[PDB]
Amino acid sequence: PFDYILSGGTVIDGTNAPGRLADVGVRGDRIAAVGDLSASSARRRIDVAGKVVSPGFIDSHTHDDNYLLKHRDMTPKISQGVTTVVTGNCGISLAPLAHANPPAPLDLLDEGGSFRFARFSDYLEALRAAPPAVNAACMVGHSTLRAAVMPDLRREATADEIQAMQALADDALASGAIGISTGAFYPPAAHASTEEIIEVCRPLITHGGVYATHMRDEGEHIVQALEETFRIGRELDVPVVISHHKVMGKLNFGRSKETLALIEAAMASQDVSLDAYPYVAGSTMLKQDRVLLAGRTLITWCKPYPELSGRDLEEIAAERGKSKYDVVPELQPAGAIYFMMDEPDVQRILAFGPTMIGSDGLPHDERPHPRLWGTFPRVLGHYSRDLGLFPLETAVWKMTGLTAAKFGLAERGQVQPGYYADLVVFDPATVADSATFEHPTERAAGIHSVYVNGAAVWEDQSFTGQHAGRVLNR
Ligand SMILES: [Cu+2]
Ligand SMILES: [Zn+2]
Numbered sequence: 001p002f003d004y005i006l007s008g009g010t011v012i013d014g015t016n017a018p019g020r021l022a023d024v025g026v027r028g029d030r031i032a033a034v035g036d037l038s039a040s041s042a043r044r045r046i047d048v049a050g051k052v053v054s055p056g057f058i059d060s061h062t063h064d065d066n067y068l069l070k071h072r073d074m075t076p077k078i079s080q081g082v083t084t085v086v087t088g089n090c091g092i093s094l095a096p097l098a099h100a101n102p103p104a105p106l107d108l109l110d111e112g113g114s115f116r117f118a119r120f121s122d123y124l125e126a127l128r129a130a131p132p133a134v135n136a137a138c139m140v141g142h143s144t145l146r147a148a149v150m151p152d153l154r155r156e157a158t159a160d161e162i163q164a165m166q167a168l169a170d171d172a173l174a175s176g177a178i179g180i181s182t183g184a185f186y187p188p189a190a191h192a193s194t195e196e197i198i199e200v201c202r203p204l205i206t207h208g209g210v211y212a213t214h215m216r217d218e219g220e221h222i223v224q225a226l227e228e229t230f231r232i233g234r235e236l237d238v239p240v241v242i243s244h245h246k247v248m249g250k251l252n253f254g255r256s257k258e259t260l261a262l263i264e265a266a267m268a269s270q271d272v273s274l275d276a277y278p279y280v281a282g283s284t285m286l287k288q289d290r291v292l293l294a295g296r297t298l299i300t301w302c303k304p305y306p307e308l309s310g311r312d313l314e315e316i317a318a319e320r321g322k323s324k325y326d327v328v329p330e331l332q333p334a335g336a337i338y339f340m341m342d343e344p345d346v347q348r349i350l351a352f353g354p355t356m357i358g359s360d361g362l363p364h365d366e367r368p369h370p371r372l373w374g375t376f377p378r379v380l381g382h383y384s385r386d387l388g389l390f391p392l393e394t395a396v397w398k399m400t401g402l403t404a405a406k407f408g409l410a411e412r413g414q415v416q417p418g419y420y421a422d423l424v425v426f427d428p429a430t431v432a433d434s435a436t437f438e439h440p441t442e443r444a445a446g447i448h449s450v451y452v453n454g455a456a457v458w459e460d461q462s463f464t465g466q467h468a469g470r471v472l473n474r
Contacts, residue, residue: 001041002027003454006425009048013415014055014404016397024053026421029453033417048425051448052392055400055413056083056422057376060275061243061358063087065094065123066109068132073463076363077134079443080376080433083422083452084135084472086358086407089243090214091183093141095123096168097148103188104333105285106147108362120172124471131467133457135422137407138471139179139212140172142200143188155191162199170203178407178474179209181243184216186285194228204238209474210273210407212241219249219291222259230266241406242274244360245349248282248340249291256345260352267354273406275358276349278378280341281437283362283369286334293324293338298437300335301366308334310367335362337369337437350379351389356406357399370440374433377444381432392428408474421454 002025010019011034023037033040059077062085068074077085087093094109095117102115109115117123120140127136145165146153157165169180180201184192201211211232215225226242233240242263247255266272282292283300297313308316313336317327349355357379361372376399384395404413411419424447431446443461450458455468 001043002032002037003042004044004046005037005040005042006046006048006053006423007037009051009053009425011415012052012054012393012396014397014400014413016394016401018391018393019052024415024423026451026454029420031415031417031419031421034415048448050427051425052428053415054396054424054426055415056424056450056452057081057399058084058086058403058407058409058413059359060086060356060403060407061089061277061360063089063092063108063360063362064136065138066111066114067363068127068136069130070111071363072130072132072467074133075463076361076372077359078450078458078463079447080373081424081426081447081450082134082376083424083450084137084409084412086137086139086178088139088141088177089181089212091141091143091181091186091189093139093144093181095120095140095144096172097144099147102147103153105183105186106144106188107333108285108335108364111364120168120177121175124176127471132469133463133467134452134469135412135472136469137178137409137474138176139181139209140169140177142180142182142192142197143186145169145200146188146192153188153191156193157196162196165200166202169200170207173203173207173209176471176473177209178472179212180204181212181214183214185214185218194232198232198235201232201236204236210239210241211236212243214243218246219252222247222252222255223262226259226262230270230272233270233272239271239273239406242272244282244358245274245276245355246282246341247345249294253342253345256348260348273354273356275356276346277358277360277371277375278346278350278383279369279371280343280346281337281339281369282341283335283337283360283365286328286332286336288325288328290325292340293328294340296339297324298337298367299331300337300362300368302331302334305331335365347389350383354402355398356403368440370433370435370437372435373441374435374444377431377446378433380426380428381446385428409472421451423451425449
């Protein structure tokens, strides 16, 4: 007998095919059958009429490394239908690094002495010992490796430093990491050369991981950053994932046409993937950057002046008698939200075929960017349903089957007999992102229930207490 059958709903199986009326049977951690299951014995037959049953959403771009440990309920993500998270992005991973004051943007993961894992394997063991509510596919970050090896980060690494970083990367991958990420845009790695990055990432071909990247520049010099990324992919001969694709700054508005054309061409000759969040504002460490700071900027948290969280930087700057750019140093370390993208470009990038959905949520932020809480329903509701940017099955494919395939998460991302039971039950008519910039932590509407490895982790708008997630391997 099946443990339960979700009956009477519409299944969107994650293979980018129109939904069809069918029941979904689960036994243990597996989807046992799909179709008319009235003839199958089941201990429970849960009515989901008027709802869609789809694979659980896989967040391809998270900074949940530490959150998985400190808040195992993972409410920001399971309340949106997320069943799996990809961690250690943009060169930022929690492990391996024992440091009481890691350099920004590594502090985006810190809750105070959180960087305590000497080996990447120690981090994975901690997750397995006290599992979170969602599955975790973890990458090791190049900036974290630099911080752990180099005495001085403002320069290229020596051969000895590269050998040390490479060994850590290899141990991480051997322990289960699914890839290595870089973020040369940030201070910790702004001085790393392309050759340094290639050498540190050599273990990816041996272990079969992916190379993920927050490109060196996403504005005026984004073409060069794209070419650097494609070059790295060819040198290593491994898949590359371009993180949170965008064109930032008014002088680059509309350039997604040009960037998407370059990516499409590269995909014809080498393995390339990309993801994006559905908003016109980004968020990361507060930084002295003329383009990030050109438009509306909001403080998400501030170490030296905590009372600044939630304030407009222009106001803070003006009242201190300085430009936003000049006032940044005295407010650091801090985080911010930057309104530097244009809707037309965001829509173009989301609609581009291969683009996967990634929230880029910064979970420790005092006053976070709403993407932390609304990303997936914003795509399913606002964009698919209300704006008609793509049909519902394609919006679902972009957060399930496509993502599972690009990251090599076997037996997940599809409602198929034999696959793992990571599932979401949502009302297609009401699913919506409730989080706004003003109230960034509101729970999404229309998410009925979420299941991870067969266990319900979200029901009646609340975490069930089931710590059902698993550390995954590629
Ligand atoms: Cu990131
Ligand atoms: Zn990034």
